[PDB]
Symmetry: D3
């Protein structure tokens, strides 16, 4: 297949000691400050019964979420030069 042969070629060309486009790449995610898991939270509300049922816990967490009283913690590892939003701790 035409498209296979191009790939196997390109492979070897990047693998060239000369060219070195292909390396191992470490990846770091900042350790996160004082934070919680949704499931643990909704679980906990039941153990304490300020929720009758689960969908009460989600609805509640959803409520909190959409008013910024909580904020989801993003799993993006990769700083982007785009119209993308970021924050310092210092607030």
């Amino acid at each position: 297949n035409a498209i296979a042969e191009k790939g196997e070629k390109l492979y070897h060309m990047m693998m060239n000691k000369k060219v070195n486009l292909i390396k191992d790449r470490r990846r770091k995610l900042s350790t996160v400050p004082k934070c919680f898991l949704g499931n643990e939270f909704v679980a906990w509300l039941l153990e304490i019964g300020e929720i009758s049922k689960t969908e009460e816990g989600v609805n509640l967490g959803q409520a909190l979420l959409e008013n910024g009283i909580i904020h989801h913690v993003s799993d993006k590892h990769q700083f982007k030069n785009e119209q993308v939003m970021y924050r310092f701790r210092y607030d």
Copy 2:
């Protein structure tokens, strides 16, 4: 086509006044506190020349990102009962 006919049927069944699985659905994202755009930031560093070039700005922002000195602002609108992480403002 078999699979089309099932769909058109199912459609009408959810569209049943009785069943009402199909509605308009508002969506809310919390307004975000004091925050910045990657592009504006990397742009600004150049206007002020504490960056020689762009890839300096990204590399820098990346550095900040992966040590939690900045945190990306997530665009998820939807509170999840899963092993997913969340935070209050109060820190």
Copy 3:
């Protein structure tokens, strides 16, 4: 730590009345037209028993999905100048 000190500095520089890279930012998601939740749907098929079991409901919904008879509703809030796809209602 070197990388901390740069951050705390940069912070104050963007916080400069002069510079104003750091603001509150409202976020809007279009209200969605007549649409449904996967869970509610698979749930409903059981209440009516045109599904023996759950994995029947998923498999079915999956079937529908991959033939465009249904389309997932995207949670992206942010119009992108990229090779990214978009649609008007008018179809």
Copy 4:
């Protein structure tokens, strides 16, 4: 390393003719109806000059997006039994 040895073992156990947890898996995405690319769109507005500059085109597309006049086309291939939203064509 402890954790490596568990992996290599588990591997062979799923690879067991008996167990067969590990197969090739085809993946289908519905062909999309009449739709457009952001970049092509913003590009086109310039060719026709109803945009002075690019950030006008994005701002405009963003405007359209957040009022549902356009909707981003999702790349999810995988029907989910969750509080996740979906639509038929028939609208």
Copy 5:
């Protein structure tokens, strides 16, 4: 509404035989090699009881994941000219 009228206009302009920004668009995802589903895996460990409970299976899979002994299979269909990472099979 001002913003509606712009949309309906723009629509018709792209719909122009002349302009043709708006087409059907096929989408392809590579068939995946020998691979497994999380749920099936954690399920299987129980059937065989090398897991006492579920959260043991997740914790284990998580362990494997974060040491590269397994790698999640990405659902991105769209090759990006960005600081984004890719691999050949030939390893």
Copy 6:
């Protein structure tokens, strides 16, 4: 505001020494094997001129992508008990 007061309360309850739902959380991403960046790749093809223009490089990479000759490297840090796909190195 009603919904604020619930949040500030819930906060303190999870912050209870007793309850401890709220901790720092380390995050690990496996170091990736021999791999490449899209931008570097498309860049390189130009330096060597087996591409006339950029959109040739993307189109090519896209071609490779959708036939599994290359595979995008996922940034998910979080093993999921779902119908989600995974792979060992051992292939």
